């Protein structure tokens, strides 16, 4: 059932919020499901911000290890945040909008915050980490989503990440692919200082009626120029960096395996090594299938156009 996810069960949410399973595991939340509406709104806000960072709130819910997102809304930022934080008259519009949604139907409460990084990638800065750590202390089920309007245009695919922080003092396990990202020199220092204080969630969608309609319409409308070359992957950057990350991860796994071959009776090492190899394989397979799809479209369209008759 495509529309099953849109059903809101208030008592079930209250039961989950009373249970607090995330207190039993700091890696509890692993997946982030984002609605088409949410994605579109967030991307539009980020690109209207242009080269300036904007932010908003995300409405949604939790389901097992998965955090869901549905909505998002701007807060009065008089004089581009002339006061502390991008809030000013924040919950003024927020609480009104919230009571108004309890009135017109929307009952999904705050599930997180989104912020934009125009032209400098998706990750959490020191300020972002402090903000998310605070959000993980009051509204425990919160997620820091970062978007990139400039990379959305450059690479073609929307650059989006979902993140959760670790509590002060707590160390992550050895397991950690950590995809490589191009970070400008004015941001790389802060990135490196805080990159191990949080982790990235797996961001996934679920199709839907919102998708079906939106996608079909805009697609036909603007894709009459269906060519757009055919390979926006031609830019080395993305592909090259992904392949480099894969190589690094696999070489690290090999170094581990070589040292673990001496220790007889370490099952955990074998477990993490197998998992890392498997993650590397799936990442490579997704890249390969994307390239294959691009080639398929290119070949079909080019053959149709050039020598049809």
């Amino acid at each position: 059932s495509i529309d099953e996810i849109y059903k809101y069960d208030k008592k079930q949410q209250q039961e989950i919020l009373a249970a607090k399973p995330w207190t039993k595991d700091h890696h509890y939340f692993k997946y982030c499901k984002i609605s088409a509406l949410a994605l579109l709104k967030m991307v539009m806000h980020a690109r209207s911000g242009g080269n300036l960072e904007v932010m908003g709130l995300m409405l949604g819910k939790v389901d097992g290890e998965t955090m869901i997102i549905m909505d998002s809304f701007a807060l009065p930022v008089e004089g581009t945040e002339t006061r502390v934080n991008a809030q000013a008259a924040a919950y003024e519009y927020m609480a009104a909008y919230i009571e108004n949604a309890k009135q017109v139907g929307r009952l999904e409460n705050a599930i997180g915050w989104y912020a934009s990084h125009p032209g400098y990638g998706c990750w959490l800065s020191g300020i972002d980490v402090s903000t998310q750590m605070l959000n993980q202390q009051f509204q425990e089920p919160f997620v820091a989503v970062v978007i990139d309007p400039t990379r959305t245009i450059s690479a073609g695919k929307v650059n989006l990440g979902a993140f959760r922080t670790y509590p002060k003092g707590y160390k992550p396990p050895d397991e950690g692919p950590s995809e490589y990202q191009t970070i400008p020199l004015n941001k790389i220092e802060d990135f490196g200082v805080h990159c191990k204080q949080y982790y990235a969630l797996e961001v996934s969608y679920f199709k839907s009626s919102l998708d079906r309609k939106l996608l079909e319409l805009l697609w036909n409308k603007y894709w009459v120029n269906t060519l757009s070359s055919s390979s926006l992957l031609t830019n080395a950057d993305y592909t090259t960096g992904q392949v480099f990350d894969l190589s690094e991860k696999l070489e690290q796994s090999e170094a581990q395996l070589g040292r673990g071959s001496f220790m007889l009776g370490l099952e955990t090492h074998d477990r993490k090594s197998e998992d890392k190899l498997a993650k590397a394989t799936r990442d490579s397979c997704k890249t390969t299938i994307e390239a294959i799809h691009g080639l398929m479209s290119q070949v079909i369209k080019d053959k149709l156009f050039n020598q049809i008759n």
């Binding site: 397979c285 299938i289 294959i292 799809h293 080639l295 398929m296 070949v299 079909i300 053959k303």
Partner: protein
């Protein structure tokens, strides 16, 4: 060529199903001749070693074909053509020996064209088993260059959409699961 391959397959089958374990001399002669046609020197050499000496002594033609095969192994084309045209081949061996001679001509013609940017006219004449002069007119009509002063020859070196769609679909099916 296609008929020769069919004959070779039939002759190979007849050798395997030999009642007394030995094939008739015509079958062995055809088998040895057809191996030389395809330049399958290893199979021809092993078949010759397999044949008992009784047939070799009772059939001097079989030894003559082996001598031709030995010349083919050494790749001495003037000797190969001389040995081919020296021994009288029976009605079952003359047509295939002529095909072997034609195969040698094409093999030598292509071999010179590839590895020899410039070759002496006498050397090319020896390679093709023909005297020099009409060999020159044979290659001039072939669009080649020949220098009369130095007697040097300058030879001139010469997927459907459905299959692609099937291969791409195989890509996708393999990477999907």
């Amino acid at each position: 060529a296609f008929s020769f391959k069919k004959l070779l397959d039939q002759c190979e089958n007849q050798e395997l199903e030999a009642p007394g374990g030995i094939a008739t001399p015509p079958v062995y002669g055809q088998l040895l001749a057809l191996y030389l046609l395809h330049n399958d020197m290893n199979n021809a050499r092993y078949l010759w070693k397999r044949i008992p000496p009784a047939i070799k002594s009772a059939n001097s033609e079989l030894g003559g074909i082996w001598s031709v095969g030995q010349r083919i192994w050494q790749r001495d084309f003037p000797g190969i053509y001389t040995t081919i045209n020296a021994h009288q081949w029976s009605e079952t061996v003359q047509p295939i020996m002529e095909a072997l001679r034609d195969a040698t001509r094409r093999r030598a013609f292509a071999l010179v064209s590839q590895a020899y940017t410039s070759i002496i006219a006498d050397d090319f004449a020896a390679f093709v088993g023909l005297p020099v002069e009409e060999a020159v007119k044979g290659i001039l009509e072939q669009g080649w260059q020949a220098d009369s002063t130095t007697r040097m020859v300058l030879p001139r070196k010469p997927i459907p959409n459905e299959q692609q769609l099937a291969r791409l679909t195989d890509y996708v099916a393999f990477l999907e699961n």
